[PDB]
Paper text:
Here, to define the structure of the deactive state, we prepared biochemically defined samples of deactive bovine complex I and determined their structure by single-particle cryoelectron microscopy (cryo-EM). The deactive complex on the PEGylated gold grids was imaged at 300 kV using a Titan Krios electron microscope and a Falcon-II direct electron detector (McMullan et al., 2014). The map for the dominant class at 4.13 Å resolution, which we assign to the structure of deactive complex I, was taken forward to model building. The cryo-EM density map for the biochemically defined deactive enzyme contains specific regions of localized disorder around the ubiquinone-binding site. Continuous densities for the loop between TMHs 5 and 6 in the ND1 subunit, the loop between TMHs 1 and 2 in the ND3 subunit (containing Cys39), the short loop between the β1 and β2 strands in the 49 kDa (NDUFS2) subunit (containing His59, one of the ligands to the bound ubiquinone head group), and several nearby loops in the 39 kDa (NDUFA9) subunit are not observed in the map. Therefore, the loss of ordered structures around the ubiquinone-binding site is characteristic of the deactive enzyme. The channel cannot be identified in the structure of the deactive enzyme because key structural elements that form it are disordered and missing from the model. ND5 and B14.7 (NDUFA11) are both represented by clear density in the deactive enzyme, supporting assignment of class 1 to the deactive state. Our preparations exhibit the well-known biochemical characteristics of the deactive state of the mammalian enzyme (Babot et al., 2014a, Galkin et al., 2008, Kotlyar and Vinogradov, 1990, Vinogradov, 1998) and are highly catalytically active following reactivation. The structure of the deactive complex matches the previously described class 1 structure (Zhu et al., 2016) and supports the unfolded Q-site model for the deactive transition.
Author numbering:
A (entry chain N): 2 to 345
B (entry chain A): 2 to 27, 51 to 112
C (entry chain b): 1 to 80
D (entry chain J): 2 to 172
E (entry chain D): 5 to 50
F (entry chain e): 6 to 94
G (entry chain O): 5 to 318
H (entry chain d): 4 to 116
Write the structure that this text describes.
């Protein structure tokens, strides 16, 4: 595909800009549906039966998500009648606002599409456009941080790490593990929103970079654990060392800068007399680490995936941000712990 | 009344159907693209609807730059359609 | 001419309706900026009062008089 | 007789009863003709003739017409009768009993609801407006404008450029 | 040291055995093939 | 807003703003109180200082307080059936 | 490769009087080598048949790699007299398939960039004839053939156009006498039933190859070794309503991007399914990969290397 | 905590550019080490001989992390000062909220063993 | 109050109608049209009663984006009928 693929990709970039730079309620409504028209062609790409099934499952869940969001916009005319994105002014519209944004994100009750959508994506270039897409509903949630009830956000954040922590244990597909770490990390996202809206934006920065480092290192084609197994000996051994720095960082480990969200999310919550919730956060986070525990053994060990066919010609992929971003993803906890102020 | 004008037309239309029945005693996916283009052009026409309706009061220097712009992209969409459209 | 004389007469021979699609639509963009006649249309458009007039309380003010015919205010008299 | 909007609103929900029920896409397609056409009248009663006729031009003059094509493309020929279909009639009978049973409580004006809002009289306060304006008024006399909302014209144009390009790449 | 038996136990299917999921077959290595058999395939006129 | 629109205008969002010609809002006078009350951050986080001006503004759009009142008159009008009832018009 | 919006584009100054002509089906003896060498007047480039040393010859640096480092215990002399109990049999064929996939990817890249007539000696679509004939007698296990078919379904479907002209050679069953006449001690003393089964399987394989809308032409032994007869038939017969005829904007570019890098095309060739014959052991493969790094071929980079070139450090 | 009298467009405020910037700080050097580290593993993923002695596009990798890191630290020096300034001004204005307690020698229980 | 007790009820009925299935995937997209139709009426009544004048353009824009989804999602439905025989919810491959 020539220029038209870049134009479609630029309209997702432009689509989230309408969401970011906004004041009107129908303006963000357009911004969400600008993405809906633009992700689907990249979802298809290679003319697959899996791609047709994934896109239809992606659309029918996210089209209903937007129409539930528009109901919250119309109730904002029923009561008050002000079309400025600041507060919902309703105990009813706030319910239909948070649950609609939960549909677009990987939050607890509306998570079922996430693993099956990720499987149907043809290439690693399309796999980024779900992790980057989650910036759009998060940007609205930052704007309407008050007037939203704790009983139907924090319950959806706690359950998502529970179902995320058990949702990747019986899975071997590399796309499916990344799809359930998405559900796992979204619980750490929305838990901060009541206890200071700050650090939610920084949690995005850590997550989006760390997820993009994975798929750019998955440019050497691998879909399963057994296909990423034949990489230690048949392919380059230095590549297994750099993926190890990204696998272990996604779980809660302090020498790596993937502990930098788990630094402040617990810290800000403990300030507001809540200890029983951050305990439940950190223990369930070990189940998220446990996926990468068995996935590190694919790279650290021999595991016998030799294969008679040996590659002599050197691999030439895109690798656009595959060098600059993992250096920041591995070490930033010693570099910038004062970056909380710089981001938000 | 508008309802009095509507119902009288429909009731006499159904009355002719009563005369028509009671009184006697004895595949191809290419055509889908037409419907796609039609529906997408309707909304651009729907946005170009208030032209002889909003131009009476509003500023002309602000409108003319935007009014032509909708018809331009309505032709730019057709410019993309020209490069391999179909046999139909 | 390399394409001014070459790629014009070919367009007349091969689909001359496409000439009309660029020329008439082209004149629709260029001519409104060039013509010194668009200024008159804006004058009467603002002059036409759809809403009711409002009276302002004057305390030492110029260019304002009574509702009767007097040399005051705007009141456009462009070509009768 | 005295009510104008409230009688049409019942027929509006009655169309949607055929959407909660699944009487095959052909009979469900007839729902958008009934509920859509009546849906114009609900808009038309409060004023704004332009906005009421938008459903006639787009939903009834495009949307369901294109939806008429896809019913012939997939799941075509014959629609199965909803009387013979199991649970489809069950969803239909439970759907009407959520509305028709409620109307009996709307009688004598005020009614108890799941929400805090009550029904009321809906005859004198049905219009909710006195005289308001005069010439080119009624809120939708000058409804749509390219002026002031210049940004919204561009973004609508962007999405309609996307639509033509994207569907071509899908098929 | 890990062998071929360890790779078979951690084989790409469902990780751990389950009573509910047994018919769930593993996907192909790259790009799944559709059931192309039994289609419309050029309609006839009489 | 996550990112502010500086040196550019694309608002026209709030009620009782710049009119298309001169057409007023149905609740124009009530927001002339509401916007003037809550222009600072004092009654934005607490929302207690402008509670008096919000209740009357909520009454403007819904008309629920008048709806309960007019129903009470209509019920008592129905109570006058076969009693001391009089109709001037 | 990525930015093709400028001058460089697919089917620009190409795809006219330039077509992929595959010379395949030589039964057992090297009969296709004579026909491909004769067809050099019309065709610009003629690639030799892929063997054990081809993978090191291409992309590497001139001289082929040793038998221990290039293909783990893989030799053509072992398949000359095939025996049971931990032998080659299938793993040489899997290496042979990988080399033939590599030469086709290079030839198709040579066709798209600068349009030239490419002649190939036994392509991918003739490989299953070479395998199934060995399977008819007791040589290869049943599970290994199904492993091959899994590679067959993935690697081929990446390439949208198969061939333009396919040449068919059907010789006499006395072709073993012609193989004995040729000066080859390794190729001699091969099974006569194996060569007979190879010709029998090819007759049922040529029919779907001809039905795939590619111009198939049959030739006899008397018709063979003719420079004038073969070239005139190639020019007169025009390819019509074939899978080769595709859109230059969408189909040709996606084909060119996949064939641009050798590692991207061979990524699907490596299967995760464990097989005892396809070399599973990692302990000896660790030293074998270390020996390749110790070798003064590539080892350090894709192009420049120490004690080989390097004009500048930057 | 949250933003009050601050607006977007151009990351530093420029109106409050009074505090001195970071000059040859140890924080700048560690990001400079990360800029060097990003110029080491680029020759590891894309196969190039010797991470220390290879191609000299590493100068771009050092400068970019220093350049972005300098403005990032300038944002850090600004925002920490403003957060402190609004904290000090809140105590000075209200006074009744922050209470002072001084001079105490209160009795406490002594633990055995 | 009076009318809003029906058009909100019609929205909740269509909300059930989307998520409930009898194998037909065409009926779900048909209900997505109804969902936007119910959102159209609910927005119209709020803008027309409280004379906004400026907000009257907003449901017209909403009508455009109603048809944006109810065509591009409808085009994907055709692609299901190209790969498979007839469109069904039961006919799936993803795990």
């Amino acid at each position: 595909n020539p220029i038209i693929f870049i134009i479609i990709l630029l309209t997702i970039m432009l689509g989230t800009i309408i969401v970011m730079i906004s004041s009107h309620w129908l303006l963000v409504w357009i911004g969400f549906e600008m993405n809906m028209l633009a992700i689907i062609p990249i979802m298809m790409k290679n003319h697959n039966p899996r791609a047709t099934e994934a896109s239809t499952k992606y659309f029918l869940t996210q089209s209903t998500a937007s129409m539930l969001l528009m109901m919250a916009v119309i109730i904002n005319l029923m009561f008050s009648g002000q079309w400025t994105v600041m507060k919902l002014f309703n105990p009813m519209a706030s319910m239909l606002m948070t649950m609609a944004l939960a549909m677009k994100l990987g939050m607890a009750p509306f998570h079922f599409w996430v693993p099956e959508v990720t499987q149907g994506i043809p290439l690693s270039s399309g796999l980024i456009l779900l992790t980057w897409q989650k910036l759009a509903p998060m940007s609205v949630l930052y704007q309407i941080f008050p007037s939203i009830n704790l009983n139907l956000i924090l319950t959806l954040s706690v359950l998502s790490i529970l179902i995320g922590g058990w949702g990747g244990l019986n899975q071997t597909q590399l796309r499916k593990i990344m799809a359930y770490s998405s559900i796992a990390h979204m619980g750490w996202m929305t838990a901060v929103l009541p206890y200071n809206p700050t650090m939610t934006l920084l949690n995005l920065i850590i997550y989006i970079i760390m997820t993009s480092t994975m798929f750019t290192m998955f440019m050497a084609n691998s879909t399963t654990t057994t296909l990423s197994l034949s990489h230690t000996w048949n392919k380059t051994p230095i590549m297994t060392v750099l993926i190890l720095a990204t696998l272990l960082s996604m779980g809660g480990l302090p020498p790596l800068s993937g502990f930098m969200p788990k630094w402040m999310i617990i810290q800000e919550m403990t300030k507001n007399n809540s200890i029983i919730l951050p305990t439940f956060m950190a223990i369930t986070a070990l189940l998220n680490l446990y996926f990468y525990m068995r996935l590190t053994y694919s790279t650290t060990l021999t595991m016998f995936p030799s294969t008679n066919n040996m590659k002599m010609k050197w691999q030439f992929p895109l690798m656009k941000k595959m060098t600059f971003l993992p250096t920041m993803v591995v070490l930033s906890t010693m570099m910038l712990p004062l970056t909380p102020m710089l981001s938000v | 009344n508008l309802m009095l004008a509507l119902l009288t037309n429909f009731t006499l239309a159904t009355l002719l159907v009563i005369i028509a029945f009671w009184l006697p005693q004895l595949f191809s996916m290419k055509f889908f693209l037409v419907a796609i283009t039609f529906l997408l052009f309707d909304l651009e026409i729907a946005l170009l609807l208030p032209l002889p309706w909003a131009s009476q009061t509003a500023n002309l220097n602000t409108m003319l730059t935007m009014a032509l712009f909708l018809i331009i992209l309505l032709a730019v969409s057709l410019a993309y359609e020209w490069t391999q459209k179909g046999l139909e | 001419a390399e394409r001014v004389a070459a790629f014009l007469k070919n367009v007349w021979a091969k689909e001359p309706v496409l000439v009309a699609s660029f020329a008439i639509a082209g004149l629709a963009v260029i001519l409104p900026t060039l013509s010194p006649y668009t200024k008159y249309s804006l004058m009467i458009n603002x002059x036409x009062x759809x809403x009711x007039x409002x009276x302002x309380x004057x305390x030492x003010x110029x260019x304002x008089x009574x509702x009767x015919x007097x040399x005051x205010x705007x009141x456009x008299x462009x070509x009768x | 007789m005295l009510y104008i909007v409230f009688i049409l609103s019942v027929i509006f929900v009655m169309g949607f009863v055929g959407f909660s029920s699944k009487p095959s896409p052909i009979y469900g397609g007839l729902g958008l003709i009934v509920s859509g056409g009546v849906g114009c009248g609900i808009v038309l009663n409060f004023g704004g003739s332009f906005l009421g006729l938008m459903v006639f031009l787009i939903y009834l003059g495009g949307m369901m017409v294109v939806f008429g094509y896809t019913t012939a493309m997939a799941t075509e020929q014959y629609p199965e009768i909803w009387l013979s279909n199991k649970a489809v009639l069950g969803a239909f009978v439970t759907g009407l009993l959520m509305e028709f049973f409620m109307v009996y409580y709307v009688l004598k004006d005020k009614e108890v609801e799941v929400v805090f809002e009550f029904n009321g009289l809906g005859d004198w306060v049905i219009y909710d407006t006195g005289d308001s304006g005069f010439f080119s008024e009624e809120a939708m006399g000058i409804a749509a404008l390219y002026s002031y909302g210049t940004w919204l014209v561009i973004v609508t144009g962007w999405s309609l450029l996307i639509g033509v390009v994207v569907i071509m790449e899908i098929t | 040291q890990p062998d071929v038996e360890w790779a078979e136990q951690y084989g790409g299917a469902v990780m751990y055995p389950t009573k509910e999921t047994a018919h769930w077959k593993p996907p192909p290595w790259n790009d799944v093939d559709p059931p192309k058999d039994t289609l419309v395939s050029n309609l006839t006129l009489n | 807003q996550k990112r502010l629109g500086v040196d550019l205008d694309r608002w026209m969002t709030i009620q009782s703003a710049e009119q298309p010609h001169g057409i007023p809002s149905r609740c124009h006078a009530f927001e002339k109180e509401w916007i003037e009350c809550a222009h600072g951050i004092g009654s934005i986080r607490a929302e207690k200082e402008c509670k008096i001006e919000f209740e009357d503004f909520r009454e403007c759009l819904l008309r629920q307080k008048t709806m309960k009142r007019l129903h009470a008159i209509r019920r008592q009008r129905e109570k006058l059936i076969k009693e001391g009832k009089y109709t001037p018009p | 490769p990525l930015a093709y919006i400028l001058g460089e584009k697919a089917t620009k100054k190409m795809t006219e009087k330039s077509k992929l002509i595959t010379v395949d089906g030589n039964i057992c003896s090297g009969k296709s080598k004579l026909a491909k060498e004769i067809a050099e007047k019309l065709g610009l480039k003629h690639f030799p048949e892929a063997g054990i040393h081809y993978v090191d010859s291409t992309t590497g640096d001139g001289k082929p790699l040793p038998v221990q480092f290039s293909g783990n215990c893989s030799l053509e002399k072992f398949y000359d007299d095939p025996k049971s109990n931990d032998g080659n049999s299938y793993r040489l064929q899997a290496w042979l398939y990988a080399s033939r996939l590599l030469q086709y990817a290079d030839a198709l890249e040579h066709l798209l960039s600068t349009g030239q007539g490419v002649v190939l000696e036994r392509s991918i679509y003739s490989d299953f004839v070479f395998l199934e004939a060995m399977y008819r007698q007791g040589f290869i296990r049943k599970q290994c053939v199904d492993h091959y078919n899994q590679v067959k379904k993935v690697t081929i479907c990446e390439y949208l156009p198969p061939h333009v002209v396919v040449y068919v050679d059907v010789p006499v069953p006395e072709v073993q006498s012609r193989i004995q006449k040729k000066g080859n001690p390794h190729e001699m003393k091969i099974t006569s039933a194996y060569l007979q089964d190879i010709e029998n399987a090819y007759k049922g394989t040529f029919l779907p190859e001809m039905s795939e809308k590619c111009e198939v032409l049959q030739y006899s032994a008397w018709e063979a070794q003719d420079a004038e007869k073969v070239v005139e038939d190639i020019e007169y017969l025009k390819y019509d309503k074939g899978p080769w005829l595709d859109q230059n904007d969408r189909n040709l570019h996606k084909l060119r991007m996949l064939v641009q890098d050798k590692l991207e095309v061979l990524n699907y060739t490596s299967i995760p399914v464990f097989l005892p014959e396809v070399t599973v052991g990692a302990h000896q493969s660790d030293q074998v990969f270390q020996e390749f790094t110790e070798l003064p071929g590539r080892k350090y980079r894709a192009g420049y290397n120490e004690d080989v070139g390097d004009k500048w450090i930057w | 905590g949250r933003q009050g009298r601050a607006t977007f467009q151009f990351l530093p405020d420029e109106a409050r550019s009074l505090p001195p910037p970071k000059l040859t700080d140890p924080r700048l050097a560690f990001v400079g080490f990360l800029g060097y580290c990003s110029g080491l593993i680029d020759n590891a993923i894309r196969r190039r001989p010797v991470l220390l002695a290879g191609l000299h596009r590493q100068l771009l990798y050092i400068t970019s992390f220093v350049f972005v890191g300098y403005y990032l630290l300038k944002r850090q020096d600004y925002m920490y000062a403003v957060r402190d300034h609004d904290m000090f001004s809140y105590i000075k204005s209200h006074x009744x909220x922050x209470x002072x307690x001084x001079x105490x020698x209160x009795x406490x229980x002594x633990x055995x063993x | 109050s009076m009318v809003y007790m029906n058009i909100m009820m019609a929205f909740t009925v269509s909300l059930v109608g989307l998520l409930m299935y009898r194998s037909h995937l065409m009926s779900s997209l048909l209900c997505l049209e109804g969902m936007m139709l119910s959102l159209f009426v609910m927005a119209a009544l709020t803008i027309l009663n409280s004379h906004f004048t400026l907000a009257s353009m907003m449901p017209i824009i909403l009508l455009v984006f109603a048809a944006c989804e109810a065509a591009l999602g409808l085009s994907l439905l055709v692609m299901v009928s190209n790969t498979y025989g007839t469109d069904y919810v039961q006919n799936l491959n993803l795990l």
